[PDB]
């Protein structure tokens, strides 16, 4: 009796991925977003970004100046390029809890990262 959830035999094509994400302080989160496909991704500022503790994610607005808000080092992403997403939070992150960040580009590509 040998049981496994999911499998490494079943894969699909990746065009976008978060290489790594983590909090850099009690109120700030960094995520590195990486275009590994072959088409330019444009208008990144119109993305939607959700962040929160696992299961309780909240939407986060772009460049509002008022927490919680996010920024991005460039709003296009060429094949092979990386941009850095920073989320600025209004309440400190707890030390004993898993968090998830999720990004949905305008074209609909959806990527997440759990730390």
């Amino acid at each position: 009796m040998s049981s496994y959830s999911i499998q490494q035999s079943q894969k699909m094509l990746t065009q976008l991925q978060i290489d790594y994400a983590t909090n850099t302080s009690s109120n700030t989160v960094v995520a590195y977003l990486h275009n590994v496909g072959e088409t330019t991704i444009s208008y990144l500022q119109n993305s939607v970004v959700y962040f929160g503790p696992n299961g309780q994610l909240q939407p986060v607005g772009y460049n509002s100046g008022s927490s919680p808000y996010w920024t991005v080092t460039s709003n296009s992403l060429q094949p092979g390029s990386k941009v850095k997403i920073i989320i600025y939070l209004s309440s400190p992150l707890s030390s004993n809890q898993y968090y998830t960040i999720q990004i949905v580009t305008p074209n609909g590509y959806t990527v997440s990262y759990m730390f």
């Binding site: 009796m1 049981s3 939607v48 959700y50 994610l57 609909g108 959806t110 759990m114």
Partner: protein, 130 residues
Amino acid sequence: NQAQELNHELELEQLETKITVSSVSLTGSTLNVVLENNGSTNLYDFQGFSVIVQYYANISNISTFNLSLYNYTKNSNPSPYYWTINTPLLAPGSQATLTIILPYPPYPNTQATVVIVTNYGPSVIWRGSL
């Protein structure tokens, strides 16, 4: 934009879905798998599950490879190539027994593979002997 919201909701349902197999037991041609919901999503859209079995049937005392998809039914008397489950909704933390009607009784002490796929995508593979 609404594709963005649909994809958001779905991908978080895929992240929060997890199932595992507690136990497997055979009677005649009917296979009983005890499934446990270890995620934080409710599971109920069983038409959209997958149940695939690869096993060795006993056909006239010859052990014969068999690979088949089984479809869900609410019918309490399911035919071969069908399966049923004894709950209407498998909630986080709960267990339920899935009943699969194989087309032939398994040949004794032959190995088998059982694949159970939730409607969201995440699945579980069990390998053992029947």
